[PDB]
Symmetry: C3
Subunit: 131 residues, 3 copies
Amino acid sequence: PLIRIDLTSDRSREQRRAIADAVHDALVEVLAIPARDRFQILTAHDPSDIIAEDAGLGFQRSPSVVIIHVFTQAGRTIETKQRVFAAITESLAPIGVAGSDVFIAITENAPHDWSFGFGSAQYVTGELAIP
Amino acid sequence: PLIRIDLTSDRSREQRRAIADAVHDALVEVLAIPARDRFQILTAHDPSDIIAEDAGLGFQRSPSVVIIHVFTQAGRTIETKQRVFAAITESLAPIGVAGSDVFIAITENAPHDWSFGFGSAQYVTGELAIP
Amino acid sequence: PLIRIDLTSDRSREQRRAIADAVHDALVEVLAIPARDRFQILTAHDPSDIIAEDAGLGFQRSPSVVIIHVFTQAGRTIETKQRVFAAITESLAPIGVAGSDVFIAITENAPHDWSFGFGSAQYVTGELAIP
């Protein structure tokens, strides 16, 4: 999967990387992807640039929001996706990211929609095994 | 929906926030989403980092391009999406964004592809109503 | 299509642009999209904020990775995508982007998911031909 993590520049570089590490540990545990199937883009913002409310659920967030956008191939069940959300949030709690400040979205594609390098689609050639 | 708004640094911090306000308000009007269903990431770029032309439609854009990438649940009709494009662009005009400088894209997913926080999939649990 | 190109800040302004040009030229050569159907957002990061390993394929990348995320409408064949992945990488090679350092992902939507400006959905109105 390719993960876009948009968070706030108020967080230290150390913590930003820990957040990234946390997200990856979680996906590996839940999804059983290769340990090295790690592809993440960390974009830090002034908190004013991230606006994330509650869709009327009834809770507030701090300014230190963390938005995690997961681009992964289709196939995963609803419960597996629920597991991902729970796993990521839990792994982020101890490293200073509150549950209220996590927002997660999934966007799917297919195996043939990926090139890991060298201009090759490794799922299509079979060099890389599909989950 | 999660809205990625990429625009340029020549626009005032004030104007951006206003741009963001107008896009949200447009979506509440056309999509009838909860008023607090606001999830936006603002990335201001050096204009050289955004290259948006006209696909041969025969018009020019200022360097101050504004690209709106809407990530929303599948199900909206073709006509509703047209209403969204038009409402957004009409709301941006008075704010200082010419019609030529707007570009909008929609990318879809499922209700079970969202966690609004706390590690839960609110659309799945029933904590949050589905469109 | 809309392309998110995420690369590292150490690359020069001229190189960033040639990288963007190389990617566009590739899509034109392979997808036969219009020459001016060009929509690219570039984001430069400290290399620490782009994390791309090998998914266990058994190779290493330099810090100067380039992630290219193609948002385009569905319809292209697997083989055509293979050819796209190839073209992009081959075009980027002499620009100083090694094959090891390119990561490509594709995300699809529909013709009615596009506004090229002026509050209009151009594929829907016939103003622009479905490619």
